[PDB]
């Protein structure tokens, strides 16, 4: 109802008229919590690492504190 931005209230109705004339050649709002009851069953990807500047990339601590797989 919020982040899909097509089905919202404030911006929702406008996107329809903003659709191109599409001359030639989805995430519905009705979803509930009942789908995906357990958010983790081999579904999610872990959060992407924070980025780093290309210039100063040699600044990074060389070695991690723990052993990742």
């Amino acid at each position: 109802k919020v982040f899909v931005d097509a089905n919202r209230f404030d911006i929702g109705d406008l996107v329809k008229a903003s659709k191109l004339p599409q001359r030639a050649n989805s995430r519905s709002r009705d979803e509930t919590c009942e789908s995906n009851p357990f958010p983790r069953l081999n579904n999610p990807k872990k959060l992407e690492p924070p980025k780093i500047l290309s210039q100063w990339s040699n600044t990074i601590p060389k070695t991690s504190i723990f052993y990742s797989v």
Partner: protein, 187 residues
């Protein structure tokens, strides 16, 4: 438009010793008195969580313990540091178990590799378990609601913990431990 402003950081792995192993549980307890039994040491390290015990060496005046979850291990390391047992300040840190100790001691004489092998993980999702919690004693059909503790460990059997019966059992063993402890049967 070849190079980019930002990259994901890449970083080296720290050789995998028992100190950099994120799964390590067993805590090496050094500086004992060697007047102490193992059932007394269990009394010290019991409340920090459920224990899968390993051993206390003889004559070496240093033991070690092993918990199920690392949170209980760290709670024990921070909980007891420098805590005297039989009038000896205890110094405890991370250390491996008995078999990996054997694999190390065979290498110490032959000074070859000493390649560590990390502890096994718990294969983690688990929605029923709440780390650092004990089942104080042993038919249960529960609601499996979030607040209650669903699964647990036994001092090797996974048991479903009944929230009502667990408190009265733990208090029962608590009031027994006083009467037996005062007269010398339990120590």
């Amino acid at each position: 438009n070849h190079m980019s402003q930002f990259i994901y950081p890449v970083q080296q792995q720290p050789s995998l010793n028992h100190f950099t192993d994120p799964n390590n549980t067993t805590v090496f307890i050094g500086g004992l008195s060697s007047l102490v039994t193992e059932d007394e040491l269990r009394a010290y390290f019991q409340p920090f969580g459920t224990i899968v015990y390993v051993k206390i060496p003889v004559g070496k005046c240093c033991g070690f313990v092993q918990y199920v979850d690392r949170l209980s291990a760290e709670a024990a390391i921070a909980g007891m540091q420098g805590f005297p047992i039989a009038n000896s300040r205890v110094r405890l840190s991370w250390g491996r178990s008995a078999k990996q100790t054997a694999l190390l001691q065979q290498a110490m004489l032959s000074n070859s590799l000493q390649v560590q092998q990390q502890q096994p993980g718990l294969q983690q999702p688990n929605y029923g378990y709440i780390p650092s919690s004990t089942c104080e004693a042993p038919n249960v059909s529960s609601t499996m609601l979030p607040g209650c503790q669903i699964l647990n460990y036994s001092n090797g059997q996974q048991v479903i913990m009944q929230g009502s019966e667990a408190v009265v059992n733990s208090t029962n063993a608590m009031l027994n431990r006083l009467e037996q402890g005062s007269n010398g049967f339990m120590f």
